[PDB]
Coordinates of C-alpha atoms and ligand atoms in Angstrom, one line a residue:
Chain S
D1 CA 32.2 4.1 14.3
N2 CA 32.9 3.3 18.0
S3 CA 30.7 6.0 19.6
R4 CA 28.1 4.8 22.2
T5 CA 24.9 3.7 20.7
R6 CA 21.3 4.3 21.9
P7 CA 19.8 1.5 24.0
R8 CA 17.4 -0.7 21.9
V9 CA 14.1 -0.3 23.8
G10 CA 10.8 -2.1 23.4
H11 CA 7.4 -0.5 23.7
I12 CA 4.0 -2.3 23.8
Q13 CA 1.7 -0.9 21.1
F14 CA -1.5 -1.3 23.2
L15 CA -3.5 1.6 24.7
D16 CA -2.3 0.5 28.1
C17 CA 1.2 1.9 27.3
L18 CA 0.1 4.9 25.1
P19 CA 0.2 7.3 28.0
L20 CA 3.7 6.1 28.7
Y21 CA 4.6 6.7 25.1
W22 CA 3.1 10.2 25.5
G23 CA 5.4 10.7 28.5
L24 CA 8.5 9.4 26.5
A25 CA 7.7 11.9 23.7
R26 CA 7.0 14.9 25.7
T27 CA 10.1 14.6 27.9
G28 CA 12.3 14.0 24.8
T29 CA 13.2 10.6 26.1
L30 CA 12.4 8.8 22.9
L31 CA 15.4 10.4 21.3
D32 CA 17.7 8.6 23.8
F33 CA 16.1 5.4 22.4
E34 CA 16.1 3.2 19.4
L35 CA 12.5 2.2 19.8
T36 CA 10.6 -0.9 18.7
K37 CA 6.8 -1.0 19.0
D38 CA 5.1 -4.4 19.1
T39 CA 2.8 -6.7 21.0
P40 CA 4.0 -8.0 24.4
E41 CA 4.8 -11.6 23.5
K42 CA 7.0 -10.4 20.6
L43 CA 8.8 -7.7 22.6
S44 CA 9.5 -10.3 25.3
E45 CA 11.0 -12.7 22.8
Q46 CA 13.2 -9.9 21.3
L47 CA 14.5 -8.9 24.7
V48 CA 15.2 -12.5 25.7
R49 CA 17.1 -13.3 22.5
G50 CA 19.2 -10.1 22.4
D51 CA 17.4 -7.9 19.8
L52 CA 16.5 -5.4 22.5
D53 CA 18.5 -4.2 25.5
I54 CA 15.7 -3.0 27.6
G55 CA 11.9 -3.3 27.4
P56 CA 8.6 -4.6 28.8
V57 CA 8.4 -8.3 29.5
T58 CA 5.1 -10.1 30.2
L59 CA 5.4 -11.4 33.7
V60 CA 5.5 -15.1 32.9
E61 CA 8.2 -14.7 30.3
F62 CA 10.2 -12.6 32.8
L63 CA 9.9 -15.2 35.5
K64 CA 11.1 -18.0 33.1
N65 CA 14.2 -15.8 32.3
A66 CA 14.7 -14.2 35.7
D67 CA 18.4 -15.2 36.0
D68 CA 19.1 -13.2 32.8
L69 CA 17.0 -10.1 33.4
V70 CA 17.0 -7.2 35.9
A71 CA 13.6 -5.7 36.7
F72 CA 13.0 -2.0 36.9
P73 CA 11.5 -0.9 40.3
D74 CA 8.4 1.2 40.6
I75 CA 7.0 0.8 37.1
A76 CA 4.9 -2.1 35.7
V77 CA 1.6 -2.7 33.9
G78 CA -0.9 -3.7 36.5
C79 CA -4.1 -3.3 38.4
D80 CA -5.6 -3.4 41.9
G81 CA -9.0 -4.8 41.1
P82 CA -10.2 -4.3 37.6
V83 CA -7.6 -4.0 34.8
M84 CA -10.4 -3.5 32.1
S85 CA -8.2 -4.8 29.2
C86 CA -7.5 -8.4 30.2
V87 CA -10.7 -10.4 30.1
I88 CA -12.6 -13.7 29.8
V89 CA -15.4 -13.2 27.3
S90 CA -18.0 -16.0 27.7
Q91 CA -21.3 -17.1 26.2
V92 CA -22.0 -19.2 29.3
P93 CA -21.3 -18.9 33.0
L94 CA -17.7 -19.8 33.9
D95 CA -18.6 -22.9 35.8
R96 CA -20.3 -24.4 32.7
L97 CA -16.9 -24.4 30.9
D98 CA -15.7 -27.9 32.0
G99 CA -14.9 -29.7 28.7
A100 CA -16.0 -26.6 26.7
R101 CA -13.8 -24.8 24.2
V102 CA -11.9 -21.7 25.2
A103 CA -9.8 -19.5 22.9
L104 CA -6.5 -18.0 24.1
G105 CA -5.4 -14.9 22.1
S106 CA -1.8 -15.5 21.1
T107 CA -0.5 -12.1 22.1
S108 CA -0.7 -12.9 25.8
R109 CA 1.5 -15.1 28.0
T110 CA 0.5 -14.0 31.5
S111 CA -3.2 -13.3 31.1
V112 CA -3.9 -16.6 29.5
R113 CA -2.0 -18.3 32.4
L114 CA -4.0 -16.3 34.9
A115 CA -7.2 -17.2 33.2
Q116 CA -6.2 -20.9 33.3
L117 CA -5.3 -20.7 37.0
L118 CA -8.6 -19.0 37.8
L119 CA -10.8 -21.4 35.9
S120 CA -9.0 -24.5 37.2
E121 CA -8.2 -23.6 40.8
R122 CA -11.0 -21.2 41.6
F123 CA -14.0 -22.3 39.5
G124 CA -12.9 -26.0 39.1
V125 CA -13.4 -26.3 35.4
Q126 CA -11.0 -27.8 32.8
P127 CA -11.7 -26.5 29.3
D128 CA -10.3 -27.6 25.9
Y129 CA -7.9 -24.7 25.5
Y130 CA -6.5 -23.6 22.2
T131 CA -4.3 -20.6 21.0
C132 CA -5.3 -18.4 18.1
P133 CA -4.9 -14.8 16.9
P134 CA -7.0 -12.4 18.9
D135 CA -10.3 -11.8 17.1
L136 CA -13.4 -11.9 19.2
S137 CA -15.7 -12.6 16.2
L138 CA -13.9 -15.7 15.0
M139 CA -13.3 -16.8 18.6
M140 CA -16.9 -16.6 19.5
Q141 CA -17.8 -18.6 16.4
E142 CA -15.6 -21.5 17.4
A143 CA -15.4 -21.3 21.2
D144 CA -17.6 -20.9 24.2
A145 CA -15.2 -18.3 25.7
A146 CA -12.2 -16.3 24.8
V147 CA -9.3 -14.7 26.8
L148 CA -8.3 -11.3 25.4
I149 CA -5.8 -8.6 26.2
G150 CA -4.9 -5.2 24.9
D151 CA -7.2 -3.1 22.7
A152 CA -9.2 -6.2 21.6
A153 CA -10.0 -6.9 25.3
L154 CA -10.9 -3.3 26.1
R155 CA -13.1 -3.3 23.0
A156 CA -14.9 -6.5 24.1
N157 CA -15.3 -5.1 27.6
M158 CA -16.6 -1.7 26.7
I159 CA -18.3 -2.3 23.3
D160 CA -18.8 -5.7 21.8
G161 CA -19.8 -7.5 25.0
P162 CA -22.6 -5.2 25.9
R163 CA -23.6 -5.0 22.2
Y164 CA -24.0 -8.7 21.8
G165 CA -24.9 -9.8 25.4
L166 CA -21.7 -11.6 26.2
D167 CA -20.3 -11.8 29.7
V168 CA -17.0 -10.1 30.1
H169 CA -15.1 -11.1 33.2
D170 CA -12.2 -8.8 34.4
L171 CA -9.2 -10.9 35.2
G172 CA -7.8 -8.3 37.5
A173 CA -11.2 -8.4 39.4
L174 CA -11.4 -12.2 39.4
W175 CA -7.9 -12.4 41.0
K176 CA -8.7 -9.6 43.4
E177 CA -11.9 -11.5 44.5
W178 CA -9.9 -14.7 44.9
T179 CA -6.8 -13.4 46.7
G180 CA -7.5 -9.8 47.8
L181 CA -4.2 -9.0 45.9
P182 CA -3.3 -6.6 43.0
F183 CA -1.9 -8.1 39.9
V184 CA 1.1 -7.4 37.6
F185 CA 0.9 -8.4 34.0
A186 CA 4.2 -7.0 32.6
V187 CA 7.4 -5.5 34.1
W188 CA 10.2 -3.5 32.6
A189 CA 13.7 -5.1 32.5
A190 CA 17.2 -4.8 31.2
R191 CA 19.1 -7.8 29.9
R192 CA 21.5 -8.7 32.6
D193 CA 24.5 -8.5 30.2
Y194 CA 23.4 -5.0 29.1
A195 CA 22.8 -3.9 32.7
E196 CA 26.4 -4.9 33.7
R197 CA 28.1 -3.6 30.5
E198 CA 26.3 -0.3 30.7
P199 CA 25.2 0.4 34.3
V200 CA 24.6 4.2 34.0
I201 CA 22.8 4.1 30.7
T202 CA 20.5 1.5 32.3
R203 CA 19.8 3.6 35.4
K204 CA 19.2 6.7 33.2
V205 CA 16.7 4.7 31.0
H206 CA 15.0 3.5 34.2
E207 CA 14.8 7.0 35.6
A208 CA 13.5 8.4 32.3
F209 CA 10.8 5.8 32.3
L210 CA 9.7 6.8 35.9
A211 CA 9.7 10.5 34.9
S212 CA 7.7 9.8 31.7
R213 CA 5.2 7.6 33.6
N214 CA 4.8 10.3 36.2
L215 CA 4.2 13.0 33.6
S216 CA 1.7 10.8 31.8
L217 CA -0.4 10.5 35.0
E218 CA -0.3 14.3 35.4
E219 CA -1.4 14.8 31.8
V220 CA -3.7 11.8 31.5
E221 CA -6.7 13.9 30.3
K222 CA -4.6 15.3 27.4
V223 CA -3.6 11.7 26.4
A224 CA -7.2 10.6 26.5
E225 CA -8.5 13.6 24.7
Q226 CA -6.0 13.1 21.9
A227 CA -6.3 9.3 21.6
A228 CA -10.1 9.5 21.6
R229 CA -9.9 11.1 18.1
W230 CA -8.3 7.9 16.7
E231 CA -10.0 5.1 18.8
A232 CA -13.4 3.5 19.0
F233 CA -13.5 4.7 22.7
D234 CA -14.4 8.2 23.8
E235 CA -12.4 10.5 26.0
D236 CA -14.2 9.6 29.2
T237 CA -13.7 5.9 28.7
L238 CA -10.0 6.3 27.9
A239 CA -9.4 8.6 30.9
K240 CA -11.2 6.1 33.1
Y241 CA -9.1 3.3 31.6
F242 CA -5.8 5.1 32.0
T243 CA -6.5 5.9 35.6
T244 CA -7.7 2.4 36.4
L245 CA -4.5 0.8 35.3
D246 CA -1.9 0.7 38.1
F247 CA 1.7 1.3 37.0
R248 CA 3.2 0.9 40.4
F249 CA 5.8 -1.7 41.3
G250 CA 6.8 -1.7 44.9
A251 CA 6.4 -4.1 47.9
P252 CA 2.6 -4.7 47.5
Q253 CA 2.9 -5.5 43.8
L254 CA 5.9 -7.8 44.3
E255 CA 3.9 -9.7 46.9
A256 CA 1.3 -10.3 44.2
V257 CA 4.0 -11.4 41.8
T258 CA 5.5 -13.8 44.4
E259 CA 2.2 -15.5 45.1
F260 CA 1.2 -15.8 41.4
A261 CA 4.6 -17.3 40.8
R262 CA 4.1 -19.8 43.6
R263 CA 0.8 -20.9 42.2
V264 CA 1.8 -21.4 38.6
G265 CA 5.6 -21.8 38.4
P266 CA 5.7 -25.6 38.7
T267 CA 3.5 -25.9 35.7
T268 CA 4.8 -22.9 33.8
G269 CA 8.5 -23.6 33.6
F270 CA 10.1 -21.6 36.4
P271 CA 10.8 -22.3 40.1
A272 CA 7.9 -21.4 42.4
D273 CA 10.3 -19.4 44.5
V274 CA 12.0 -17.7 41.5
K275 CA 13.9 -14.6 42.6
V276 CA 13.1 -11.3 41.0
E277 CA 16.3 -9.2 40.8
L278 CA 15.6 -5.5 40.8
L279 CA 17.8 -2.7 39.5
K280 CA 19.6 -1.3 42.6
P281 CA 19.6 2.4 43.2
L282 CA 23.1 4.1 43.5
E283 CA 24.1 4.8 47.1
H284 CA 25.6 8.2 47.9
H285 CA 28.1 9.6 50.4
Chain W
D1 CA -14.0 -1.2 13.3
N2 CA -14.6 1.5 10.8
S3 CA -13.1 4.2 13.0
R4 CA -10.9 7.1 11.8
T5 CA -7.3 5.9 11.8
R6 CA -4.0 7.9 12.3
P7 CA -2.4 9.1 9.1
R8 CA 0.5 7.0 8.1
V9 CA 3.5 9.3 8.1
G10 CA 7.1 8.9 7.0
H11 CA 10.2 10.3 8.7
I12 CA 13.8 10.4 7.5
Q13 CA 16.0 8.6 9.9
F14 CA 19.0 10.9 9.2
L15 CA 20.3 13.5 11.6
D16 CA 19.0 16.2 9.2
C17 CA 15.4 15.4 10.4
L18 CA 16.2 14.5 14.0
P19 CA 15.5 18.0 15.3
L20 CA 12.1 17.8 13.6
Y21 CA 11.6 14.4 15.3
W22 CA 12.4 16.1 18.6
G23 CA 9.7 18.6 17.7
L24 CA 7.1 16.0 16.9
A25 CA 7.8 14.3 20.2
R26 CA 7.8 17.3 22.5
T27 CA 4.5 18.7 21.0
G28 CA 3.0 15.2 21.3
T29 CA 2.3 15.3 17.6
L30 CA 3.8 11.8 17.1
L31 CA 0.8 10.3 18.8
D32 CA -1.4 11.6 16.0
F33 CA 0.7 9.6 13.5
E34 CA 1.4 6.1 12.6
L35 CA 5.1 6.7 12.0
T36 CA 7.6 4.9 9.7
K37 CA 11.3 5.7 9.9
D38 CA 13.5 4.9 7.0
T39 CA 15.9 6.4 4.5
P40 CA 14.6 8.9 1.9
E41 CA 14.5 6.7 -1.2
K42 CA 12.4 4.0 0.7
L43 CA 10.0 6.6 2.1
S44 CA 9.5 8.2 -1.3
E45 CA 8.7 4.8 -2.8
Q46 CA 6.3 3.9 0.0
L47 CA 4.4 7.2 -0.3
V48 CA 4.2 6.9 -4.0
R49 CA 2.8 3.4 -3.9
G50 CA 0.3 4.1 -1.1
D51 CA 2.0 2.6 1.9
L52 CA 2.1 6.0 3.5
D53 CA -0.4 8.9 3.4
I54 CA 2.0 11.8 4.1
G55 CA 5.8 12.0 4.3
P56 CA 9.1 13.5 3.1
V57 CA 9.7 13.0 -0.6
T58 CA 13.1 13.5 -2.1
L59 CA 12.7 16.3 -4.7
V60 CA 13.3 14.4 -7.9
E61 CA 10.8 11.7 -6.9
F62 CA 8.3 14.4 -6.0
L63 CA 8.8 16.0 -9.4
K64 CA 8.3 12.6 -11.2
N65 CA 5.0 12.2 -9.3
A66 CA 3.9 15.8 -9.1
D67 CA 0.3 15.0 -10.4
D68 CA -0.3 12.6 -7.5
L69 CA 1.2 14.5 -4.6
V70 CA 0.4 17.8 -3.0
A71 CA 3.4 19.6 -1.3
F72 CA 3.4 21.1 2.1
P73 CA 4.2 24.8 2.1
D74 CA 6.9 26.3 4.3
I75 CA 8.8 23.2 5.3
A76 CA 11.5 21.4 3.4
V77 CA 15.0 19.9 3.8
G78 CA 17.4 22.4 2.1
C79 CA 20.2 24.9 2.3
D80 CA 21.3 28.3 1.1
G81 CA 25.0 27.6 0.6
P82 CA 26.5 24.6 2.4
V83 CA 24.2 21.8 3.4
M84 CA 27.0 19.8 5.0
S85 CA 25.5 16.3 4.5
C86 CA 25.2 15.9 0.8
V87 CA 28.7 15.7 -0.7
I88 CA 31.0 14.5 -3.4
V89 CA 34.0 12.7 -1.8
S90 CA 36.9 12.4 -4.3
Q91 CA 40.4 11.2 -4.5
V92 CA 41.1 13.5 -7.4
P93 CA 40.1 17.0 -8.6
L94 CA 36.5 17.0 -10.0
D95 CA 37.7 17.9 -13.5
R96 CA 39.8 14.7 -13.6
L97 CA 36.7 12.4 -13.3
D98 CA 36.0 12.0 -17.0
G99 CA 35.6 8.3 -17.6
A100 CA 36.5 7.7 -13.9
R101 CA 34.3 5.4 -11.8
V102 CA 31.9 7.3 -9.4
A103 CA 29.8 5.6 -6.8
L104 CA 26.2 6.7 -6.2
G105 CA 24.9 6.0 -2.7
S106 CA 21.6 4.2 -3.2
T107 CA 19.8 6.1 -0.5
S108 CA 19.8 9.3 -2.6
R109 CA 17.8 10.3 -5.6
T110 CA 18.2 14.1 -5.6
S111 CA 21.8 14.7 -4.5
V112 CA 23.0 12.1 -7.0
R113 CA 21.1 13.9 -9.8
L114 CA 22.6 17.2 -8.6
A115 CA 26.1 15.8 -8.6
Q116 CA 25.6 14.4 -12.1
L117 CA 24.3 17.8 -13.3
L118 CA 27.3 19.6 -11.7
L119 CA 29.9 17.2 -13.0
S120 CA 28.5 17.2 -16.5
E121 CA 27.4 20.8 -17.0
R122 CA 29.7 22.7 -14.8
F123 CA 32.9 20.7 -14.9
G124 CA 32.4 18.9 -18.2
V125 CA 33.2 15.3 -17.1
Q126 CA 31.4 12.1 -17.9
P127 CA 32.1 9.5 -15.3
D128 CA 31.0 5.8 -15.2
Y129 CA 28.4 6.1 -12.6
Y130 CA 27.1 3.1 -10.6
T131 CA 24.7 2.7 -7.7
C132 CA 25.6 1.0 -4.5
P133 CA 25.0 0.9 -0.7
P134 CA 26.5 3.9 1.2
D135 CA 29.9 2.9 2.5
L136 CA 32.8 5.4 2.1
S137 CA 35.4 2.7 2.6
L138 CA 34.1 0.2 0.0
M139 CA 33.3 3.0 -2.4
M140 CA 36.8 4.6 -2.1
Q141 CA 38.3 1.1 -2.8
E142 CA 36.1 0.6 -5.9
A143 CA 35.9 4.2 -7.2
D144 CA 37.6 7.5 -7.5
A145 CA 34.7 9.4 -6.1
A146 CA 31.4 8.9 -4.3
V147 CA 28.2 10.8 -3.8
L148 CA 26.9 10.5 -0.2
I149 CA 24.0 11.9 1.8
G150 CA 22.7 11.8 5.4
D151 CA 24.9 10.8 8.4
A152 CA 27.4 9.0 6.1
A153 CA 27.9 12.3 4.2
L154 CA 28.2 14.4 7.4
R155 CA 30.7 11.9 8.7
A156 CA 32.8 12.1 5.5
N157 CA 32.6 15.9 5.7
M158 CA 33.5 16.4 9.3
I159 CA 35.7 13.3 10.1
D160 CA 36.8 10.8 7.4
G161 CA 37.7 13.5 4.8
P162 CA 40.0 15.3 7.1
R163 CA 41.2 11.9 8.5
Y164 CA 42.3 10.3 5.3
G165 CA 43.0 13.5 3.3
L166 CA 40.0 13.2 0.9
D167 CA 38.4 16.1 -0.9
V168 CA 34.8 16.6 0.2
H169 CA 32.7 19.0 -1.9
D170 CA 29.5 20.3 -0.4
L171 CA 26.7 19.9 -3.0
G172 CA 24.8 22.9 -1.7
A173 CA 27.9 25.0 -2.0
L174 CA 28.7 23.8 -5.6
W175 CA 25.1 24.7 -6.6
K176 CA 25.3 28.0 -4.8
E177 CA 28.6 28.9 -6.5
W178 CA 27.2 27.9 -9.9
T179 CA 23.7 29.5 -9.6
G180 CA 23.7 31.8 -6.6
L181 CA 20.6 29.9 -5.5
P182 CA 19.6 27.9 -2.4
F183 CA 18.7 24.3 -2.9
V184 CA 15.9 22.0 -1.7
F185 CA 16.6 18.2 -1.4
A186 CA 13.3 17.0 0.0
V187 CA 9.8 18.3 0.5
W188 CA 6.8 17.0 2.5
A189 CA 3.7 16.0 0.6
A190 CA 0.4 14.2 1.1
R191 CA -0.9 11.8 -1.5
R192 CA -3.5 13.5 -3.6
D193 CA -6.1 10.9 -2.8
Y194 CA -5.5 11.1 0.9
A195 CA -5.5 14.9 0.8
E196 CA -8.9 14.9 -1.0
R197 CA -10.4 12.2 1.2
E198 CA -9.2 13.8 4.4
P199 CA -8.6 17.6 3.9
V200 CA -8.7 18.6 7.5
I201 CA -6.5 15.8 8.8
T202 CA -4.0 16.7 6.0
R203 CA -4.1 20.4 7.0
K204 CA -3.7 19.6 10.8
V205 CA -0.8 17.3 10.0
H206 CA 0.8 20.1 7.9
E207 CA 0.2 22.6 10.8
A208 CA 1.7 20.2 13.4
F209 CA 4.8 19.8 11.2
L210 CA 5.2 23.5 11.1
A211 CA 4.7 23.9 14.8
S212 CA 7.2 21.1 15.5
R213 CA 9.8 22.5 13.2
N214 CA 9.5 25.9 14.8
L215 CA 9.9 24.2 18.1
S216 CA 13.0 22.4 17.0
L217 CA 14.6 25.7 15.9
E218 CA 13.9 27.2 19.3
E219 CA 15.3 24.2 21.2
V220 CA 18.1 23.4 18.7
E221 CA 20.8 23.4 21.4
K222 CA 18.9 21.0 23.7
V223 CA 18.6 18.7 20.6
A224 CA 22.3 19.0 19.8
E225 CA 23.3 18.4 23.4
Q226 CA 21.2 15.2 23.5
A227 CA 22.2 13.9 20.1
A228 CA 25.9 14.5 20.8
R229 CA 25.7 11.8 23.5
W230 CA 25.0 9.1 20.9
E231 CA 26.9 10.3 17.8
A232 CA 30.5 10.7 16.7
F233 CA 29.8 14.4 16.3
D234 CA 30.1 16.7 19.3
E235 CA 27.5 19.2 20.4
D236 CA 29.1 22.2 18.6
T237 CA 29.2 20.4 15.3
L238 CA 25.6 19.2 15.6
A239 CA 24.4 22.7 16.6
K240 CA 26.2 24.1 13.6
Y241 CA 24.7 21.5 11.4
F242 CA 21.2 21.9 12.5
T243 CA 21.4 25.7 12.2
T244 CA 23.1 25.5 8.8
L245 CA 20.3 23.4 7.4
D246 CA 17.5 25.5 5.9
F247 CA 14.0 24.2 6.5
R248 CA 12.1 26.9 4.7
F249 CA 9.9 26.4 1.7
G250 CA 8.5 29.7 0.3
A251 CA 9.1 31.7 -2.8
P252 CA 12.9 31.7 -2.9
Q253 CA 13.0 28.0 -2.4
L254 CA 10.4 27.3 -5.0
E255 CA 12.5 29.4 -7.5
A256 CA 15.5 27.2 -6.7
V257 CA 13.3 24.1 -7.3
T258 CA 12.0 25.5 -10.6
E259 CA 15.5 26.1 -12.0
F260 CA 16.8 22.7 -10.8
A261 CA 13.8 21.1 -12.5
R262 CA 14.4 22.9 -15.7
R263 CA 18.0 21.9 -15.8
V264 CA 17.5 18.2 -15.1
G265 CA 13.9 17.5 -16.1
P266 CA 14.5 16.4 -19.7
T267 CA 17.0 13.7 -18.5
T268 CA 15.2 12.5 -15.5
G269 CA 11.5 11.9 -15.9
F270 CA 9.4 15.0 -15.6
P271 CA 8.8 18.2 -17.7
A272 CA 11.2 21.1 -17.2
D273 CA 8.3 23.2 -16.0
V274 CA 6.5 20.5 -14.1
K275 CA 3.9 22.0 -11.7
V276 CA 4.4 22.0 -8.0
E277 CA 0.9 21.9 -6.3
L278 CA 0.9 23.3 -2.8
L279 CA -1.5 22.4 0.0
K280 CA -3.9 25.4 0.2
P281 CA -4.9 27.0 3.5
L282 CA -8.5 27.5 4.5
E283 CA -10.3 30.8 3.9
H284 CA -12.6 32.4 6.5
Ligands
ISJ301 O1 -2.2 -6.0 29.8 C1 -1.2 -6.7 29.0 C2 -1.3 -8.2 29.3 C3 -0.1 -9.0 29.1 C4 -0.2 -10.5 28.9 O2 -1.3 -11.1 29.2 O3 0.8 -11.2 28.6 C5 1.3 -8.4 28.7 C6 1.3 -6.9 28.6 C7 0.2 -6.0 29.1 O4 0.2 -4.7 28.5
ISJ302 O1 19.6 15.5 2.7 C1 18.9 14.4 2.2 C2 19.2 14.2 0.7 C3 18.1 13.6 -0.2 C4 18.5 13.0 -1.5 O2 19.6 13.4 -2.1 O3 17.7 12.2 -2.1 C5 16.8 13.2 0.4 C6 16.5 13.5 1.8 C7 17.4 14.5 2.5 O4 17.2 14.4 4.0

């Protein structure tokens, strides 16, 4: 059997990419895919090691592997201000965290690093960090603060936090206050070898993502209404969440990436001036 | 978090259920499911043991577990005549297989039983059967014939058979010749405990399957065009395949099921007149 095979494509299982999944299903794009659903750290690893051809990569893992990946333009997981689902949950003010314990949920690579950058270079505190599975209840038992992403973060933000009187700091907002910039937590990328071996499949997958994203924005109320039946959040919260997320990835978002990279690269295992290689559009005549 | 959670729903990874998948995607029904894709014997096992709530069940496994499963009316994987992707591939005439080695592809439970019934009771041969992974090449090396299902079977039927000059007998056809009846290979069912705990989720899932199937029939060409890009089969062949398959499950199909059950029951693991419980619609 030497027929062409479907690209192996990753997809983040979180609510932040559920509308995208909706888009992929409605357009029929999913059937051009062999799809793997998982948490971001795992999808990133799978892409990097060759178990996927294309997928979401948490920004920090992308930047560490930028020579071997080609980023998709005009789609990303991000924010301009609040992201709602990447947070620091804390039982004390942030500037009382010097020498305190802070738990880092193991599914994140970028949010944890942003939280570390913020606490250190904005607020001037140096906690005892540790990494553990995301679980607010166990985290709050052992630590003074926790960094969460995904559904666990959104839950803390919208529900647990208010319920138990815990401060929930929005990482997107903290970065925005500090720099005035938007933030990007994950990009989409093809493995470089896949991109060069199969250039048109790669462009079509890219274009099908853009189309599916676009549709998901147009149908955001339908996604929220449907997903609300299965989640702890109601329809209004989910619609608010989906429209607060910023899935753009053009010049302003790249600028945010560049500056984040410059501030953390030296201590995060990639050059501060790492070059992001974007998938080039086909010129016509 | 004690919230309602999505039903856990199986889906056969073969081409025979790809149009349905297309349907589930386009309708957005997939986002009401926590979906598991696998081969039919694995999915049957998982549903039976409580790893899935709802899913496709190969018929003989449904029949063995009929007390603990409630079947979905009006959807099934079947045929009325050729089914194209459940076959006996053979190097010799079927009536020369007595005492011959025959490989049973392990992904199947129902086609293999149908093959065994036909060989024994229609052609009067008793082969040395053995189970193994689906691989026409290895099988043809080790055996005189093999029973295949899914894409491997469709491949044997449309490509390898003609390529290497092997006889390929359509199981749906052999059954139709023998009985005049259609055949059902798999049904959809909910676990009884899940159906009773969540009656309206169960009914809505049932209804969404029907809607998606209907959609897949209406858009069958779009589905063939797309799938042809990724398979050894061309668009014409896939369209023929998807339209030859029969996804109905009403009275005529139940009759075929009852007669199959009667003929193989006593030598399988269920009564010849085992009861098929169907999910009941709501009154108003
Ligand atoms: O938001 C999420 C945060 C990420 C991280 O912190 O690594 C990765 C993927 C995003 O969906
Ligand atoms: O056709 C297939 C044959 C089956 C079998 O023989 O067990 C089960 C699922 C069907 O999709």
